[PDB]
């Protein structure tokens with residue numbers, strides 16, 4: 001009825017995502033590009049190298065857009081959102097969210113507008129450190145978080161408003177938790193599965209505080225944020241019950257936006273700065289290139305990216321080098337399917353090695369090293385690449401690819417606009433090797449001085 005690919009024989013101290021993705025490459029060398037790990041009798045077919053991931057996610061896009069069940073499910077039921085939702089709930093909501101996240105029925109003010117307001121609120125806050133050493137984690141995590149508030153509620157929040165420090169205390173708890181290394185099973189369990197639940201319930205509850213307030217004032221002819229907009233779709237598509245667009249889904253879709261939208265971004269910001277210290281000649285050119293195009297008066301902006309081949313390459317390379325999410329999130333096929341020489345039954349969990357594709361040794365020669373010129377033709381022009389998948393590929397591609405890209409580019413340039421960066425350690429020995437993690441490439445702890453600018 002269905003025949004998986006060959007893999008090692010089933011079943012197989014502190015082990016992390018960077019390590020799992022290594023093991024997966026080792027097994028590529030033995031078994032070929034497509035193979036199968038068992039886990040008792042849970043088959044997880046893994047997918048490695050560009051040709052397989054292209055073939056599967058892109059050329060068989062629909063058949064591979066399912067969501068793997070993960071390590072677990074959760075009876076607080078998070079699969080009425082985007083990340084963990086499926087079939088037709090997913091099709092309709094993703095589409096909606098997509099379009100909302102690109103200025104359709106969300107007031108006049110744009111998403112670029114918003115990352116720009118924060119971009120400034122963020123440089124302000126980085127001047128409070130007075131040039132004195134500083135761990136960017138808190139500040140850098142606050143920005144992307146506040147953007148999601150703003151897209152969703154329409155008010156960002158001073159970096160002191162308790163309502164905020166609570167929201168972000170809860171997100172950081174789910175971080176320490178989920179970025180838990182493995183050992184055969186993930187590490188955690190001991191009294192944390194219920195602090196996970198408690199916290200999700202807090203979050204839903206709070207989005208619901210704000211949803212009530214939004215329903216107080218609703219109005220076809222004036223949406224201004226996700227919640228408004230969503231409620232409007234719940235109107236246009238009534239008498240067409242039962243619906244995918246309900247309150248139950250609004251709530252888990254927003255929770256989803258904060259979850260996906262924050263630590264992935266802030267982690268990359270954290271890693272973008274770290275790499276800036278360790279590579280003072282690159283920061284130099286970037287900062288220069290920022291002089292030549294944007295100066296010190298105005299705010300940076302998405303139109304300047306295209307006049308900035310070196311800066312756009314640096315981000316790309318920050319995003320490719322760090323390998324934020326070695327294996328994406330897990331996939332699952334939507335139905336039975338013949339893929340190359342194999343029938344994979346409906347349901348089967350698919351795992352994608354983004355490491356394998358971002359870290360290809362032919363397309364990115366010397367791929368272990370960090371080098372802007374990986375995204376530069378021999379003439380120093382900007383080189384786009386079919387192999388660029390920080391955000392995955394195909395129909396489940398990060399629904400915030402464009403926004404992630406906005407916050408990275410606007411925030412980083414802003415930071416580079418107003419400040420030189422001074423590492424405590426001498427760049428020369430500064431270790432950058434990432435700390436062991438449950439599902440992401442996270443950087444070591446570091447400090448830096450944000451010195452107001454001088455040439």
Ligand code: HEM
Pocket residue numbers: 082083084094256257260261262264265268324325328329330390391392393395396397398399400401403404405
């Ligand atoms: C550097 C920033 C980010 C990176 C590297 C990133 C990366 C990814 C990756 C690798 C996936 C998995 C796609 C798959 O399952 O095959 C993903 C999914 C997702 N990302 Fe992002 N993401 C980033 C920022 C954001 C932001 C800012 C948002 C907010 C809109 C966001 C929202 C989502 C959502 C909702 C999903 C799941 C969508 C779906 O399952 O259909 N991400 N992201």
Ligand SMILES: COc1cc(NS(=O)(=O)C(F)(F)F)cc(OC)c1Oc1ccc(C#N)c(Cl)c1
Pocket residue numbers: 078083171174175178179196200255258259260261262263264267437439440442
């Ligand atoms: C995109 O993956 C994330 C999913 C969640 N979901 S959730 O925490 O609301 C739960 F458990 F209910 F599913 C949350 C995330 O954190 C805010 C996600 O993104 C993460 C998680 C951990 C790390 C690390 N380290 C990073 Cl970089 C991103």
